[PDB]
Subunit: 150 residues, 6 copies
């Protein structure tokens, strides 16, 4: 690609002091952080982020909650990072999440499940460009590259 995924710590993950933990789970798997910021996300941005859900009953409540406190959008790079990101986050519903996953370790409620992650490569490219301008995406050559992929 290089393959990239969009990860976002939600307002409850910020409140509960889990930003570094989410980042560390990607770093220890050898994934490269290429962008990050903390922001108050606007209603208009969140409506576009969740546009696939705009027809559903819970969409207005989700958009208001996601603007009720700061969030931390970020972008990770590496092999199979989209599908591995989804596994590392765990099932949407925490009670279906296996331990070792972020939601299985930290969450008890689907509406407070700490972190968002792209569900497909097409979604990831859309979300990365929605939240970050190209100038915010940093590029570097990871020294351990020969030892993390063949």
């Amino acid at each position: 690609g290089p393959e990239r995924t969009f990860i976002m710590v939600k307002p409850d993950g910020v409140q509960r002091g889990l930003v570094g933990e989410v980042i560390q789970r990607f770093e220890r798997r050898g994934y490269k952080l290429v962008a990050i910021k903390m922001m108050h996300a606007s209603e208009q941005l969140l409506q576009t982020h969740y546009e696939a859900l705009k027809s559903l009953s819970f969409f207005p409540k989700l958009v208001a909650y996601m603007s009720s406190g700061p969030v931390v959008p970020m972008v990770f790079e590496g092999r199979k990072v989209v599908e591995n990101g989804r596994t590392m986050l765990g099932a949407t519903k925490p009670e279906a999440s296996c331990p070792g996953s972020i939601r299985g370790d930290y969450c008890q409620d689907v509406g407070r499940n700490v972190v968002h992650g792209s569900d497909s490569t097409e979604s990831a490219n859309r979300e990365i460009n929605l939240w970050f301008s190209p100038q915010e995406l940093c590029q570097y050559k990871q020294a351990v590259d020969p030892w993390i992929h063949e």
Copy 2:
């Protein structure tokens, strides 16, 4: 409920220095500790605790083992805490337990599997009241409550 489950560190979990680890796995998922104590559990208490097993060949051996060293009964409170407790503990048999679970991380033998957890809400209410008097159950309002459930 508020929903509550009964968790008990078994004599081997005490010996192996895993009491804090069991507690921390519930705390980091946002669950509230509401009771805890260390005790030598009597044969009569353990026979009542395991009354569903009283007809089985291994019951006398289980009751003697569970009174052979101190145990740490405790009670946790939060959404889906009974079913999530069972997932966090792992399969009864450690070799069937996924890593990330307590028994998958620490155990190799079903008869030394570190920790007990209620299997149903009806069992949890029975076990909580069997091991703790109402005066031992503490109540407080968790400050992070708005960020752990909706």
Copy 3:
């Protein structure tokens, strides 16, 4: 002695989900847990606990704060456990605490410093007996004993 010290997680340590962490720091140093409970501590108990401070301006405020939410008293056993307990907790003032200590890792304010620990063997014996009846103190022989002391 066997030497024993009294450790108590304060209301802020309970709220912030640090009970298991405090316990684990003693367990991994080979210390034996011999008693623990969660309780709402009464004004009368806390006045006796802090009787050395009864003449000081901040005593009424300290006693009210220490009864404002549940606490977790506990007792640990092993060689040099009183003096090592004080080192493991860190300076009273978090800003004077070295990292690696509980208060240096988790605290920013002397009035919210998570955990209490006996300052002398005479204080420890007094505090243990103040908070626990003899029947609550459990005794067992630690299997790793030959490898934790000579």
Copy 4:
């Protein structure tokens, strides 16, 4: 203030996958993240950041190194965060750093010491405003606030 300090993961901390670890050390002490970003820092920015060092022999080499790969500037908020930040980072020279500090845990060379932190409140205010526009500084009320300071 509210008191704030500027923390920056240096290019070697990014390469070595330590961004989340630095963040987590501040979060677990109850400090609030209020800004963060990943960027390629320019020579002009770094010369201003290090203006106190502009007369010294190693300044050109330091500025070139600090622009040789991406960095992660960030801002933390809470009581005594400037002086506690310096303690948490450890001595400038890793060999003088106590274990438990970031540089004592991860570093072996003063020129690759992973992370920068403000040395005074006057430096912190200058550095925060140098690296972040006011619109990038987020504000929220931490739910655990009553339990982290008095």
Copy 5:
């Protein structure tokens, strides 16, 4: 048996500083380390180690990679250690590995999957004797033995 399995940190696990982590995952499950060494493995040794794969297209490339940097062979002892070793390592393919497993936590590429583990008791006995002479296998009685198995 006593049952034993062969575990080997591959060249990428050495480079990425994961030797202690692999060892610790077995130790915390109560397994006994009975042999370990760091070596440059020769082509002839690796061809014998992987003799089941000698007919396959990727065998020469695998043998050259496995001799391209030092490896850490080791031997662990305890109940069900072969089958539990395979679960703890995770699926061969990291993207099929559950979090909590070594490859699910640290790996993104099947050709850089950090660690080898015996797939059967017959393979384990063969591999142990291939990499270690009998004099390198140490024997001791684990003090916690009564608390890790019945």
Copy 6:
């Protein structure tokens, strides 16, 4: 040098499952493992290892204890690794050790203090060559080298 130090997990560190933990503390500081093995150390080897102590009353008891169960000698390489090794291990006496050090985190008795480390570069060269033949010392180029030292 390249500078190297000799580290040895003592019989109590093996029993207590701390081998991986000792290794991980050096790895996360960027130090290179260059040799390791598990062995039953003979009286003659240990008398030579501790020859500086041969005149002292406790020497025979120390030599018998150090041969009473397997040990794990090892060798680490990197900048200032001898002096940093001593800091990471902590004071000889655990009660004088700061938290964050190995002995401050895990030990309560000077005669069961888990791990040995060279006290000087002259001692390190002697001890490395006493415990390892030159063929056991592995050499490789660490990919992160440009980011761990200047």
